[PDB]
Design a protein around this motif. Sequence first.
Motif, PDB file in Angstrom:
ATOM      1  N   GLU F 236       0.836  -1.080  -0.080  1.00  0.00           N
ATOM      2  CA  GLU F 236      -0.099  -0.004  -0.103  1.00  0.00           C
ATOM      3  C   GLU F 236       1.064   1.091   0.025  1.00  0.00           C
ATOM      4  N   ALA F 237       1.973   1.024   0.879  1.00  0.00           N
ATOM      5  CA  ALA F 237       2.988   2.198   1.007  1.00  0.00           C
ATOM      6  C   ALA F 237       3.578   2.463  -0.510  1.00  0.00           C
ATOM      7  N   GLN F 238       3.892   1.506  -1.234  1.00  0.00           N
ATOM      8  CA  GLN F 238       4.514   1.626  -2.673  1.00  0.00           C
ATOM      9  C   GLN F 238       3.452   2.120  -3.560  1.00  0.00           C
ATOM     10  N   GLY F 239       2.161   2.158  -3.236  1.00  0.00           N
ATOM     11  CA  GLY F 239       1.090   2.846  -4.222  1.00  0.00           C
ATOM     12  C   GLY F 239       0.217   1.854  -4.784  1.00  0.00           C
ATOM     13  N   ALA F 240       0.201   0.463  -4.484  1.00  0.00           N
ATOM     14  CA  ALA F 240      -0.536  -0.542  -4.973  1.00  0.00           C
ATOM     15  C   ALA F 240      -2.365  -0.057  -5.080  1.00  0.00           C
ATOM     16  N   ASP F 241      -2.998  -0.283  -6.172  1.00  0.00           N
ATOM     17  CA  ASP F 241      -4.389   0.372  -6.188  1.00  0.00           C
ATOM     18  C   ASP F 241      -5.148  -0.579  -5.232  1.00  0.00           C
ATOM     19  N   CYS F 242      -4.864  -1.825  -5.431  1.00  0.00           N
ATOM     20  CA  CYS F 242      -5.737  -2.869  -4.657  1.00  0.00           C
ATOM     21  C   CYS F 242      -4.635  -3.926  -4.235  1.00  0.00           C
ATOM     22  N   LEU F 243      -4.800  -4.541  -2.859  1.00  0.00           N
ATOM     23  CA  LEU F 243      -3.982  -5.456  -2.398  1.00  0.00           C
ATOM     24  C   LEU F 243      -4.560  -6.914  -2.395  1.00  0.00           C
ATOM     25  N   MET F 244      -3.989  -7.920  -2.032  1.00  0.00           N
ATOM     26  CA  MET F 244      -4.606  -9.207  -2.545  1.00  0.00           C
ATOM     27  C   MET F 244      -3.975 -10.166  -1.288  1.00  0.00           C
ATOM     28  N   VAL F 245      -4.893 -11.267  -1.070  1.00  0.00           N
ATOM     29  CA  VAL F 245      -4.420 -12.328  -0.401  1.00  0.00           C
ATOM     30  C   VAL F 245      -4.361 -13.726  -1.252  1.00  0.00           C
ATOM     31  N   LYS F 246      -3.411 -14.361  -1.157  1.00  0.00           N
ATOM     32  CA  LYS F 246      -3.487 -15.542  -1.929  1.00  0.00           C
ATOM     33  C   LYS F 246      -2.674 -16.580  -1.619  1.00  0.00           C
ATOM     34  N   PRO F 247      -3.018 -17.871  -1.116  1.00  0.00           N
ATOM     35  CA  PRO F 247      -4.302 -18.257  -1.655  1.00  0.00           C
ATOM     36  C   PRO F 247      -5.310 -17.481  -0.381  1.00  0.00           C
ATOM     37  N   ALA F 248      -6.829 -17.584  -0.609  1.00  0.00           N
ATOM     38  CA  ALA F 248      -7.866 -16.887   0.064  1.00  0.00           C
ATOM     39  C   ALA F 248      -8.343 -17.993   1.145  1.00  0.00           C
ATOM     40  N   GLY F 249      -9.062 -19.035   0.512  1.00  0.00           N
ATOM     41  CA  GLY F 249      -9.860 -20.039   1.277  1.00  0.00           C
ATOM     42  C   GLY F 249      -9.029 -20.464   2.679  1.00  0.00           C
ATOM     43  N   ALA F 250      -8.042 -20.855   2.830  1.00  0.00           N
ATOM     44  CA  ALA F 250      -7.448 -21.067   3.946  1.00  0.00           C
ATOM     45  C   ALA F 250      -6.662 -19.909   4.599  1.00  0.00           C
ATOM     46  N   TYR F 251      -7.134 -18.767   4.116  1.00  0.00           N
ATOM     47  CA  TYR F 251      -6.413 -17.632   4.891  1.00  0.00           C
ATOM     48  C   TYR F 251      -7.248 -16.530   5.131  1.00  0.00           C
ATOM     49  N   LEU F 252      -8.713 -16.790   5.421  1.00  0.00           N
ATOM     50  CA  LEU F 252      -9.554 -15.783   5.498  1.00  0.00           C
ATOM     51  C   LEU F 252      -9.212 -14.942   6.758  1.00  0.00           C
ATOM     52  N   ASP F 253      -8.389 -15.471   7.909  1.00  0.00           N
ATOM     53  CA  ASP F 253      -8.225 -14.563   8.793  1.00  0.00           C
ATOM     54  C   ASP F 253      -7.166 -13.497   8.420  1.00  0.00           C
ATOM     55  N   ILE F 254      -6.273 -13.940   7.542  1.00  0.00           N
ATOM     56  CA  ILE F 254      -5.405 -12.781   6.874  1.00  0.00           C
ATOM     57  C   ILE F 254      -6.210 -11.893   6.182  1.00  0.00           C
ATOM     58  N   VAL F 255      -7.041 -12.243   5.460  1.00  0.00           N
ATOM     59  CA  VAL F 255      -8.056 -11.276   4.710  1.00  0.00           C
ATOM     60  C   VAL F 255      -8.556 -10.274   5.653  1.00  0.00           C
ATOM     61  N   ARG F 256      -9.398 -10.975   6.648  1.00  0.00           N
ATOM     62  CA  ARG F 256     -10.012 -10.162   7.755  1.00  0.00           C
ATOM     63  C   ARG F 256      -9.293  -9.228   8.559  1.00  0.00           C
ATOM     64  N   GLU F 257      -7.836  -9.561   8.954  1.00  0.00           N
ATOM     65  CA  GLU F 257      -7.073  -8.500   9.522  1.00  0.00           C
ATOM     66  C   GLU F 257      -6.489  -7.612   8.778  1.00  0.00           C
ATOM     67  N   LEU F 258      -6.244  -8.038   7.618  1.00  0.00           N
ATOM     68  CA  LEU F 258      -5.862  -7.018   6.352  1.00  0.00           C
ATOM     69  C   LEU F 258      -6.841  -6.018   6.434  1.00  0.00           C
ATOM     70  N   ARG F 259      -8.047  -6.389   6.016  1.00  0.00           N
ATOM     71  CA  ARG F 259      -9.392  -5.521   5.970  1.00  0.00           C
ATOM     72  C   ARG F 259      -9.342  -4.580   7.110  1.00  0.00           C
ATOM     73  N   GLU F 260      -9.011  -4.895   8.378  1.00  0.00           N
ATOM     74  CA  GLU F 260      -9.225  -3.810   9.392  1.00  0.00           C
ATOM     75  C   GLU F 260      -7.810  -3.220   9.411  1.00  0.00           C
ATOM     76  N   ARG F 261      -6.931  -3.358   8.768  1.00  0.00           N
ATOM     77  CA  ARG F 261      -5.584  -2.538   8.474  1.00  0.00           C
ATOM     78  C   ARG F 261      -5.431  -1.542   7.401  1.00  0.00           C
ATOM     79  N   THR F 262      -6.438  -1.800   6.510  1.00  0.00           N
ATOM     80  CA  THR F 262      -6.075  -0.616   5.444  1.00  0.00           C
ATOM     81  C   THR F 262      -7.488  -0.249   4.670  1.00  0.00           C
TER      82      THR F 262
END
Lengths: 323, 323, 323, 323, 323, 323
Positions: F236-262
């Motif tokens: 985000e600091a480098q300017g990305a327009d959208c971020l992404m978590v991959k894989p997603a299925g077994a990483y929903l906690d990461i998705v949730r924490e990132l959602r609360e951080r950006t």
Amino acid sequence: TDLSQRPRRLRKSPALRAMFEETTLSLNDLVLPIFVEEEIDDYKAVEAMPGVMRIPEKHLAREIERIANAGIRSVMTFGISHHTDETGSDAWREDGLVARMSRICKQTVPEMIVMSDTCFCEYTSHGHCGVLKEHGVDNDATLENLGKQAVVAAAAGADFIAPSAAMDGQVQAIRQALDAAGFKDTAIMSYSTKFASSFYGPFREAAGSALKGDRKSYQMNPMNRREAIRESLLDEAQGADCLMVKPAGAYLDIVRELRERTELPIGAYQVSGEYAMIKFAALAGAIDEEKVVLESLGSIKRAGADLIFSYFALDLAEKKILR
Amino acid sequence: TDLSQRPRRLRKSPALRAMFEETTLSLNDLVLPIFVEEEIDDYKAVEAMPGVMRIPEKHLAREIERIANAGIRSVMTFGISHHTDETGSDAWREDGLVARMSRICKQTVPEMIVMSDTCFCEYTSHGHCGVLKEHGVDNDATLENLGKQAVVAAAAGADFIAPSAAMDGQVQAIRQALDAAGFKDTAIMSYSTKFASSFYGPFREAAGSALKGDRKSYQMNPMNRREAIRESLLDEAQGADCLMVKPAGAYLDIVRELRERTELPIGAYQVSGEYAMIKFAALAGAIDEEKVVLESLGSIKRAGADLIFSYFALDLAEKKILR
Amino acid sequence: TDLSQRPRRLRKSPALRAMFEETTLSLNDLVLPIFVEEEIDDYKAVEAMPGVMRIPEKHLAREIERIANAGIRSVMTFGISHHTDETGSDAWREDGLVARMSRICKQTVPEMIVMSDTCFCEYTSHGHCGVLKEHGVDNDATLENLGKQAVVAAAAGADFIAPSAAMDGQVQAIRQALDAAGFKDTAIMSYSTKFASSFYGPFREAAGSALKGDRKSYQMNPMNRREAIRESLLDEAQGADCLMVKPAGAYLDIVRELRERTELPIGAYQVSGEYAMIKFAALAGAIDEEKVVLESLGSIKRAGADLIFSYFALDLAEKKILR
Amino acid sequence: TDLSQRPRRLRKSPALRAMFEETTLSLNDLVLPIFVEEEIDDYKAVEAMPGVMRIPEKHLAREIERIANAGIRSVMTFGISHHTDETGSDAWREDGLVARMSRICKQTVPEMIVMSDTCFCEYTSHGHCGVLKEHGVDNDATLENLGKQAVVAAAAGADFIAPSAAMDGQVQAIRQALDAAGFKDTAIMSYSTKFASSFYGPFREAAGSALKGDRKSYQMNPMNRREAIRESLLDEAQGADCLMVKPAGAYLDIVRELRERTELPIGAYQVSGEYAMIKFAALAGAIDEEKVVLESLGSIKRAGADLIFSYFALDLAEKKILR
Amino acid sequence: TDLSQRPRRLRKSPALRAMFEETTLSLNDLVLPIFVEEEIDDYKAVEAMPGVMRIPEKHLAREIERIANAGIRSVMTFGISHHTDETGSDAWREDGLVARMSRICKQTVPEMIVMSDTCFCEYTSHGHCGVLKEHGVDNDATLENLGKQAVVAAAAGADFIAPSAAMDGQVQAIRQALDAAGFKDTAIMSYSTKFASSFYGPFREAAGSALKGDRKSYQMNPMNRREAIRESLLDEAQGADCLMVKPAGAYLDIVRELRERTELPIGAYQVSGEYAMIKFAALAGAIDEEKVVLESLGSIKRAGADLIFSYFALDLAEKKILR
Amino acid sequence: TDLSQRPRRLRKSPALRAMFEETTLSLNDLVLPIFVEEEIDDYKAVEAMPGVMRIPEKHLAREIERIANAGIRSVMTFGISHHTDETGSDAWREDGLVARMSRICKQTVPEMIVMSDTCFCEYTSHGHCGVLKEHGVDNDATLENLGKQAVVAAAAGADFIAPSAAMDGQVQAIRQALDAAGFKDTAIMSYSTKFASSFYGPFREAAGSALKGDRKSYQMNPMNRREAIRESLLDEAQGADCLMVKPAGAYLDIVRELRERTELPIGAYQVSGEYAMIKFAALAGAIDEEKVVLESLGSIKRAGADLIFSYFALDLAEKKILR
Ligand SMILES: [Zn+2]
Ligand SMILES: [Zn+2]
Ligand SMILES: [Zn+2]
Ligand SMILES: [Zn+2]
Ligand SMILES: [Zn+2]
Ligand SMILES: [Zn+2]
Ligand SMILES: [Zn+2]
Ligand SMILES: [Zn+2]
Ligand SMILES: [Zn+2]
Ligand SMILES: [Zn+2]
Ligand SMILES: [Zn+2]
Ligand SMILES: [Zn+2]
Ligand SMILES: [Zn+2]
Ligand SMILES: [Zn+2]
Ligand SMILES: [Zn+2]
Ligand SMILES: [Zn+2]
Ligand SMILES: [Zn+2]
Ligand SMILES: [Zn+2]
């Protein structure tokens, strides 16, 4: 009695306590600090650190291999110099002790994660963690030297350059030097939060620092919790790969607060004094060594440390207490 | 170098470090644990706790007065029983050791803040912190006894009843008993978070607990940080006046997290093992005792403790190191 | 009644209140502001600040030594100029009053932590905190001067340069100037959050500022809590070593919020008006001076201030009320 | 200079400062404390509170009407008793002074929001805030009396019963009594956080409390910020309609922290000592009274107070300074 | 390039990734669900769960011992009934399958932590998780039955009663029943957050539930994250010893949010569908089974789960993949 | 039973569950990854991804139009190269496959949101995500190439350049290159958090990456939750327009924490392995495909993802399951 909540229900047996144990400890959390003395034939015993020896540089490839064999993942090298000077210049000589410890460790066991302690207290005449001027330990002159040392250490094979001199801007200085020197891949294990602790007694005898006086003008006040967090955050801002709290044992609150303030890895140093307090009490029969060590270490992990620098590491590994 | 931020600027001299020191330590933060043995003439030395003596009950009014004179504000009484039984019933006898320690302390020095350790490990045949059944240490039967003990201790003069048996609902049980008995003003210094620590070795020799086995079914797992906070919060919910983390030394992260989770006062216990680790290392010359003690204690205060139970208290007071 | 929670239990006696007292106050928290008038023989009494005197520069080494002897750790110097001009240029003369106060203090008592108030209100013809233009008090022209003053003050011995002119970018400006001038070690005690308070009446008579009008175009609105926090955070961003809230007495909420928003030290100024409100009410017998002062000061510490600038400091020190 | 951020841009003129002023102050924020003495013909001047008079009960309907006419929304009644006794029983007599103040105020100006100070310090022989026993000021006996007083005060017309005795469970006790007595609609303006402050000197002379000693066993320690928040939260838990911090002036950090910890309204008391410090300094010409009062009051509002009890209220109203 | 931050530096080798690995997985985190069918001679293969067998009750003591021998710490028992009825009454018969599974497991391996799945879907004619009425699955009638079942299961040896019926107040109901029945020490492993997931297909074939329809009126909506957290918090309020999120695999965000909302232990169920998705893809050669399982499980631990219910547990144990 | 809270009340019927459903899923949340193979005539079936075909470049305009017609809003293009080399240079040729996929998609359906997968694993001889050196996959040499590729892809019509090589500074590098090349409007869909997952098996067969070994030196450790958040924040600091978590299925906690951080948009990738686990289990009849897919996808949306990359997208669109 009418108690709906009974925490004792999950403490009933060993199996239940193991299922519910919130913290783990393993060899993957330990870093072995090692003391290497150049130009010596026999291992020297560090009296204030029962069981700890100074490794003669000539036995170093043997020890590192022993260390590796026990399952130890990484070591922090500390040298005992026979070439000190007003500025600890051997520390930056291409073939000074610093480089050789690193080179010997990495050539002997290439997968060994070598961390080089980066300072000058063990190479200076006066024993201070840097360049001594009339104002005291000059920050900036020290930074330049740290940078030079970092490049030779990295050139020699160190995976992490670990500045323990407590100088301001040391991570930034060392990062620029490594990058400019072409060691962009070399990491920095900062001793980000290092207090002017009284728990370092034994170390002086182990590592040979000649200091007659104190390091209070650079190492921070043990009582300063806010400053301690800021110290490490500045280090993250300067690019450190891993941060660290030292000492660790009496600073678990700092470890915990830092853990909640950064996503960076956090190392924690179980200093010589901690190691000595346990050994001596255990020697007197006042406590059980193995239990106290594991609790001590587990406590550091509980506080949030990803890595712990402990002088007990090899023994725990060899005795198979941790794997 | 170009460094706008230089934390070393406020570490330049002793005056600056004192102006900026974030934590203070004084006699107002210390509680002296005291060991009183009934039916004995001479002070007994606790070998595993160099410098610590068991006070004969007959010298108690003299010691307490000495303690008071040094400026010590409060003590935690621990008895060495010559009347143990399967349930530690002397603990609840109107004139059992528990009551007498309290009564002697308060009559001799009425302004002395007396805390009574409330448990049974020192009065039971088996040495456990309570009533022993075939299921182990029965929670509820112990609660009833704790309550009975609390009333006699309070009746005797104790300002705080300090349950250290690690039983579930102990604060609630003791509060009901005190209230019903008419001691609504008697406080509760809960040993809210008490781990099944290996740092209690020395204590067993000091206080005389006959336990052959462990207390893991009641004292909580040293590794459990979430449970540790919940343990103390349940205690706040049950009305404790002050909470406590024990041991304190290797649990400063718990102390800090609890401090951010409650407005209640928080006590922290520098256990016998901590005291022994320092004494023995200091005896071996590996560390400076006075510096390590103060750093140790200051660290506990830094973590957020309002009170510290330390066996060094009297010595620091008498030597005028703290005031 | 059935009340499980009784906060009054820990208020029962003085001993209990001392054990539970959450805030401490000592000489390590105080900074003595001192008023020095050049070219005068006798001490001048500041009528609006009963007990406060303007020190003739010629008695300065004597006073500072007296101040030091009482245990006072540091002073904030304020000059009364006999060389004012449109820009307060004496403030930046190598040997202007600013430099001399600093030099005299530091040569006489080298361990004395000297803070130099850095502004121009006491040296300008018009009495404003800076360079007066047709737009009002020019920010940028003032910054240049502040920087010049800082270098001469630092050159003279000041440990902290304390900008109190309320100019934007003043910390940045002064830091660049000190660094460029080679005083990288000189700290900055910013008057980060300084309101356009009505509590500065007495000061004008004490320090001699000739201002006829107000400082509302630079000192911030007393009502602005969000701006007040931002003001100080910008200062942290510009590198200040310590931040400050002034006045402190009626701004303890700001002190508390800032304390939760930065790890930097925080100073708090108990302004002349606060000091006068207490003195005058005490003189009228409406309040007890000593109790009100200590409560006032303790309140500032409770709010989170690491240091307090108080005109009562020397008296509390000398009377041994604080140590 | 290159400064993108310039906070001074919004301080340029009075219009801009008014647009950006973050806090407002109006008559809707003030509560007038009033002192009524029974059985007297002439107004009595409270020397320690310049400008403050004791209103003879016979002039009360006239004063209240005057107060109402100025736009004052509410008053806090304080009585000066000519019928004190060991328990301040007049406070609970259907026609004691407490009731009459309330009744007179509400019958004369029915829309006037009457708050009744609910305590016994002004009606007891010994001057304590309650029932005096050998243990000190008995909590529970006082609670019963407070409850009785609350019912007669409410029966008399008080809109708020305001317990200022600092007793534990006082809100709960008074709420039960009002509810049982059928005054479910009667509110409770708790003096939730009331410190054992040295800022109450003047009050004693104004209200006539006969106390020779202190109230430290009930009023909480000025230094205790965590306890202060807990004190008020317990009050919210017991159902108080509004909470309060008293004193307010030197406790703005407490006001701010409480504001962030509850959704309940928060009152703040600008005590007699605050009022006296301002009056006396203003009388000495050291400060401008009107500016200091407004800043003082605005500061209390900035901290988060919804209501302020100020002795300046009527004067500000009458002089049209606030509307 | 000029990149001061390079996360790839700690991913360079296996040793470095192991030192920095933030999450651990071991046999102490696993609970083996086991399927026991009464009145059968041979193991039955659950086609939709490759490798999973229904254990004939007669081979149960052998299997449990096998399970124990592999190092498995605990099991969750699931029965396949040959005695179903409209209410699943066998579940509460002193000697129904539920009791026998528990009794057999605990007598055979006393240190085995037995969790009893507590529901009726496997014992009812209609296959629903409870008592079927015209309104659907009656909440309250089910609660009574759950309670009865819990007592017989606990009486039989179960360490944890694990209600998986998704009924409101089930933890409260079961806790009261256990307490009243004298099983105050029996824990409750609530299936606190259990969604009406489509990942339970395989289970129906494994456990034999006769349900023709859905459980959407009791199991919560997979999409409801706020409700999911509230569901578990209500369970903590009702006294559950451990909470749980089920399924776990596609609900790691729920696991993480719950972990930040409670200090209670949290179990996570890797449902049959998860187990089947991995087995079938692995069977097709699309993925590596062992790697996917460990990542899957490690992910659940990363999310914050203290325990995981996984059908792979025994295989991982036996193959020595986890210890 | 007496239960005031009954969550089951809003689960009673389908209408109620729909009113209360907290998460939605629609075609606006999906991105279709598409595989295009150059120089081939017939569609190739990806065996490890039942139902997934490699599109011959010659049928591409037809497929994209089909994709567009179904309502699919965007696609992620993946090429199967017939021109690989040591550095995957075709990826940056003005007319390499990367450009052509983009150009064909955008010319055929101009409103189609084209995302170009930006990496080299599909174009290199060795199959690694970049330039292979003796140190491994050179970070910086790869960055330069990524940048070159980004410009040709953008020049060709790609709306988003999506770096999936896991190189440090890749967003910064690609942003500079696009800007310098004049494509300031071209967005960056960073694969910000991409783990070294075992869920990518199928992909290798689909996209043709020749890699024999692993990507653990660049793709991050699946177990590292803190690092995972930091990885995306650096992006985000480098300017990305959208971020992404991959894989997603077994990483929903990461998705949730990132959602609360950006506040940035967050994409989530339902990898090939996830798609294969569902297809294969569904093929075996162990689960219902449509239900599992929707729950899987809905779960990813519940976790906080704004966009999901799913291979099921077209099928869900065409079958009208989502609109
Ligand atoms: Zn040599
Ligand atoms: Zn050093
Ligand atoms: Zn530093
Ligand atoms: Zn006897
Ligand atoms: Zn005990
Ligand atoms: Zn407990
Ligand atoms: Zn002159
Ligand atoms: Zn000024
Ligand atoms: Zn400013
Ligand atoms: Zn009368
Ligand atoms: Zn009163
Ligand atoms: Zn209260
Ligand atoms: Zn049968
Ligand atoms: Zn069921
Ligand atoms: Zn529920
Ligand atoms: Zn070709
Ligand atoms: Zn790639
Ligand atoms: Zn990255």
